[PDB]
């Protein structure tokens, strides 16, 4: 019944598939009898974040084993897991809290997506119904267009040497514009240094990402793992962001984003720092990597500089980063331009 293009139709089907939501939850070890998709709520994930933040402070303070156990038990009581024989992994370190926090980041977007799906008027094709739910215009970029060529070159060129486990294939290029996002970004368009950068996420998140845009982790969330504090992270290297799709031989198709990001005065940093407050004058944070995209090969797509230069070496050898990463701490500093459907070819 829907007049929408097949790639768009196929995209709506994909980002709203309830089975891949459950499949994610199962992989996460969650008890689906006690915690089914429906019972999953914003308030419990908020509460769970808060417990993880407590576990972090308990680790920082170097609190009692009794404390860390009761704290760990409280988390698993809130987010019921099912290991069968295996005893629940004790949350008593940075990696443990970071891990569970990232799970919650995902569960939160899953809740966003499932709620969106269940909500609204219940005629009109369901694929059309759900496309409208995303409040995002999705248009297909022609395979043989100047646009597509620029994008595919950026994908080919900024594919790292280290990420040699896969080969990326651009199945579909979508030109997207989220409802009201353009007006939101318009004041930050006045800022200098507007770059077109990569953002990779699990497919289960993309309904929420298109629905509410990219967002920053709440206050409740632990500051652990966020190398440069809670903000929106980006890469000039397709590989770096493609990693975050969590693709496999099983599910080799993943989704990536191209977004206009107003960086302005970048706070160029070598090593990790949980910022919270940026220095007076600065608008973003640039994690300086040992490998930088060729600056002498920077292109200008719609008056936005695309660093599609081949992976060359940067002068900094005294850094904890292998590649460049960019962080903004105001969600309006981003305007999403493209969504790419990539096929990961493993070896
Ligand atoms: C606890 N979770 C911590 C955490 C989770 C995700 C990210 C992150 N850093 C990035 C740097 C970068 F350049 C690109 C990306 C990311 C991400 C995750 C989001 N996607 C990116 O492509 C960073 C920290």
UniProtKB/Swiss-Prot annotation:
There is a cross-link at residue 87 (Glycyl lysine isopeptide (Lys-Gly) (interchain with G-Cter in SUMO2)). There is a cross-link at residue 87 (Glycyl lysine isopeptide (Lys-Gly) (interchain with G-Cter in SUMO1)). Changing residue 208 to L: Increased DNA-independent poly-ADP-ribosyltransferase activity. Changing residue 222 to G/S: Does not affect DNA-independent poly-ADP-ribosyltransferase activity. Changing residue 234 to S: 10% of wild-type activity. Residues 1-118 form the PARP alpha-helical domain. Residues 125-347 form the PARP catalytic domain. The modification Phosphoserine is found at residues 121, 123. Changing residue 52 to F: Leads to constitutive activity in absence of DNA damage due to unfolding of the PARP alpha-helical domain, relieving autoinhibition. Changing residue 230 to I: Abolishes enzymatic activity. Changing residue 220 to Q: Does not affect ADP-ribosyltransferase activity. It is found in: Cytoplasm. NAD(+) binds at residues 199-201, 208, 215, 241. Changing residue 208 to S: Does not affect DNA-independent poly-ADP-ribosyltransferase activity. The active site is at residue 325. Interacts (when auto-poly-ADP-ribosylated) with AIFM1. Promotes AIFM1-mediated apoptosis. This form, which translocates into the cytoplasm following cleavage by caspase-3 (CASP3) and caspase-7 (CASP7) in response to apoptosis, is auto-poly-ADP-ribosylated and serves as a poly-ADP-ribose carrier to induce AIFM1-mediated apoptosis. This is Poly [ADP-ribose] polymerase 1, processed C-terminus. It comes from Homo sapiens. The chain holds residues 662 to 1010 of 1014 of the full protein.
């Amino acid at each position: 019944k829907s007049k929408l293009p097949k790639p768009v139709q196929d995209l709506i089907k994909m980002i709203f598939d309830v089975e891949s939501m459950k499949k994610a939850m199962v992989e996460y070890e969650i008890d689906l009898q006690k915690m089914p998709l429906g019972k999953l709520s914003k308030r419990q994930i908020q509460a769970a974040y808060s417990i993880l933040s407590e576990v972090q402070q308990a680790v920082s303070q170097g609190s009692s084993d009794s404390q860390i156990l009761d704290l760990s038990n409280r988390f698993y009581t809130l987010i019921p897991h099912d290991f069968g024989m295996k005893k629940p992994p004790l949350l008593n370190n940075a990696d443990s809290v970071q891990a569970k926090a990232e799970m919650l980041d995902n569960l939160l977007d899953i809740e966003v997506a499932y709620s969106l799906l269940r909500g609204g008027s219940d005629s009109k094709d369901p694929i059309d119904v759900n496309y409208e739910k995303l409040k995002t215009d999705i248009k297909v970029v022609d395979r043989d267009s100047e646009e597509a060529e620029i994008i595919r070159k950026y994908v080919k060129n900024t594919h790292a040497t280290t990420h040699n486990a896969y080969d990326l294939e651009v199945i579909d290029i979508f030109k997207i514009e989220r409802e009201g996002e353009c007006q939101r970004y318009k004041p930050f368009k006045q800022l200098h240094n507007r770059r077109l950068l990569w953002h990779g996420s699990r497919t289960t998140n993309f309904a929420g990402i298109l629905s509410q845009g990219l967002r920053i982790a709440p206050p409740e969330a632990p500051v652990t793992g966020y190398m440069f504090g809670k903000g929106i992270y980006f890469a000039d290297m397709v590989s770096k962001s493609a990693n975050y799709c969590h693709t496999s031989q099983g599910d080799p198709i993943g989704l990536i984003l191209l977004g206009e990001v107003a960086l302005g005065n970048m706070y160029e940093l070598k090593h990790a720092s949980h910022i919270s407050k940026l220095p007076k004058g600065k608008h973003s944070v640039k994690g300086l990597g040992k490998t930088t995209p060729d600056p002498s090969a920077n292109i200008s797509l719609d008056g936005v500089d695309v660093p599609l230069g081949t992976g060359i070496s940067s002068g900094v050898n005294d850094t904890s980063l292998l590649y460049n990463e960019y962080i903004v701490y105001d969600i309006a500093q981003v305007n999403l331009k493209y969504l790419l459907k990539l096929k990961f070819n493993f070896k």
